[PDB]
Design a protein around this ligand. Structure first.
Ligand SMILES: *[C@@H]1O[C@H](CO)[C@@H](O)[C@H](O)[C@H]1NC(C)=O
Lengths: 138, 149
């Protein structure tokens, strides 16, 4: 019986089974729910993307300078530093043979001096890139 | 009958009393006759005196990967009468293993007066007070009667 009322409403088993609007902060997204579920609050590192509505639950982004990590944005990881690439659930430290210098930069392979006819003056690392140059010709 | 359950309204970690959702029709809250929640001082009132079983729930999640540690303490203070209920949850530090969750449960029989006001104060001592928040809907102060009537 209490089933016929749509999303955004519930039926209380007090107040004789009737359908009523949801409490000020709450949502019901489906069917004959006996209760309006609590809206997610986005605070701290979280910023509210979609505000709380009776039909749809709220969604949380993170603070500028951060990024979401996890399924429903369960965590917030600080934007990774040089020599780091976001691994989609975790931030690896670059990769062996590659480099990234940037806040948000993606780790990219080193410059190849063999194709330019020169040789490595300074070998590369995670943070910096190979700088080529002539060999010890003197 | 006589019983109640309230879901904590608060999310972040800040010292001082906790707000609660008293409205039936919310997910996990139940409020029956003889018990009202005062939205001014954030303390629910038990009209009829007796012996009650009061249980405590605290669940915390790590919202920032790599930061946070310390302890988060919860205490249930009796207004008209120092700590009737004590639950101290520890937050693990960031390690190779991932522990993002911390939980605790406390309960015991309490004798409540007529018009006794009950409230929960949150006091947390942590390294980074951020990076750890209360899980929404998982923090609950329950009550149900024992003494017959
Ligand atoms: C640069 O470092 C890599 C990583 O160990 C190494 O394999 C490579 O031989 C180095 N370059 C040269 C010219 O030795």
């Amino acid at each position: 019986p209490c089933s016929n009322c749509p999303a955004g409403t519930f039926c209380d088993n007090n107040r004789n089974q009737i359908c009523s609007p949801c409490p000020p902060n709450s949502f019901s997204s489906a069917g004959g729910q006996r209760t309006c579920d609590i809206c997610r609050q986005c605070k701290g590192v979280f910023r509210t993307r979609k505000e709380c509505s009776s039909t749809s639950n709220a969604e949380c982004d993170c603070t500028p300078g951060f990024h979401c990590l996890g399924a429903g944005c369960s965590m917030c990881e600080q934007d990774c530093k040089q020599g780091q690439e976001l691994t989609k659930k975790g931030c690896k430290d670059c990769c062996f043979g590659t480099f990234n210098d940037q806040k948000r930069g993606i780790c990219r392979p080193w410059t190849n001096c063999s194709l330019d006819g020169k040789s490595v003056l300074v070998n590369g690392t995670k943070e910096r890139d190979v700088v080529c140059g002539p060999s010890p010709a003197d | 009958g006589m019983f109640a359950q309230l879901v904590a309204q608060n999310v972040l970690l800040i010292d001082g009393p906790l707000s609660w959702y008293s409205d039936p029709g919310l997910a996990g809250v139940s409020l029956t006759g003889g018990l009202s929640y005062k939205e001014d001082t954030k303390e629910l009132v038990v009209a009829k005196a007796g012996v009650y079983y009061v249980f405590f729930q605290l669940e915390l999640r790590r919202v920032v990967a790599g930061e946070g540690s310390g302890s988060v303490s919860l205490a249930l203070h009796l207004q008209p009468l120092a700590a009737a209920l004590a639950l101290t949850v520890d937050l693990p530090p960031a390690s190779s293993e991932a522990r993002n969750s911390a939980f605790g449960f406390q309960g015991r029989l309490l004798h409540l007066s007529a018009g006794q006001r009950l409230g929960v104060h949150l006091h947390t001592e942590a390294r980074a007070r951020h990076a750890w928040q209360l899980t929404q809907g998982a923090t609950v102060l329950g009550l149900f009667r024992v003494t017959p009537e």
